[PDB]
């Protein structure tokens with residue numbers, strides 16, 4: 001099953017909700033990730049150019065997909081097929097971001 | 106600010122998360138709505154045809170936008186500009202639904 005991460009739209013996009021599969025994949029419990037930016041999933045071998053593409057997409061509230069090297073709580077690397085989409089209201093205000101996380105290792 | 110409702114994809118789409126604006130708009134605290142289908146927001150003056158359109162869209166996991174009459178916890182009616190989108194993984198599995206709620210009574 002694919003994980004899901006929901007963040008606030010502003011500040012530094014703190015996590016406000018994760019589903020069960022997020023914990024299955026990453027080894028982190030909800031309580032230890034809520035209020036944090038999801039970048040804690042990154043590590044030494046994470047590709048900087050990929051991170052920059054995510055950074056730009058989020059800044060512009062544009063949908064993006066990347067295959068990015070992430071790390072479980074225990075430090076084991078995994079390949080994360082990550083898809084991020086903005087959540088907008090009818091007036092175009094960005095309410096939140098939703099990320100889908102699939103372990104494609 | 107617009108409210109947000111996140112539900113599971115299956116088994117009559119129980120609410121798994123709401124943002125603070127949801128509480129401001131509807132008068133319900135998270136604890137009062139988690140694990141329930143959002144249809145408790147509806148009431149007697151809610152348009153049945155609108156509800157039917159939502160029902161069919163959600164069953165097919167299709168995005169839908171409707172203006173629907175809803176009710177706060179205390180029974181006060183309000184017009185809800187509601188936008189629902191499925192969340193899918195790249196294999197096409199529906200992971201969740203996300204609803205945006207805007208009070209457009211005024």
Ligand SMILES: Cc1cc2nc3c(=O)[nH]c(=O)nc-3n(C[C@H](O)[C@H](O)[C@H](O)COP(=O)(O)O)c2cc1C
Nearest residue numbers: 005007013037038039041042051054055097098099
């Ligand atoms: C909803 C959402 C989910 C995210 N999920 C992940 C993730 O699973 N793995 C990851 O490495 N980054 C993820 N990110 C990206 C980071 O949070 C961050 O935006 C990215 O590293 C670029 O910003 P930075 O250069 O400040 O790190 C997610 C971002 C958002 C908004």
Ligand SMILES: Cc1cc2nc3c(=O)[nH]c(=O)nc-3n(C[C@H](O)[C@H](O)[C@H](O)COP(=O)(O)O)c2cc1C
Nearest residue numbers: 110112118142143144146147159160163202203204
């Ligand atoms: C994510 C999500 C959010 C929803 N938000 C609302 C809402 O704010 N107001 C509402 O009247 N119905 C809302 N619904 C629709 C009801 O939960 C339900 O799907 C609809 O009433 C049709 O089913 P029914 O005929 O069994 O009631 C939402 C559904 C989903 C999946």
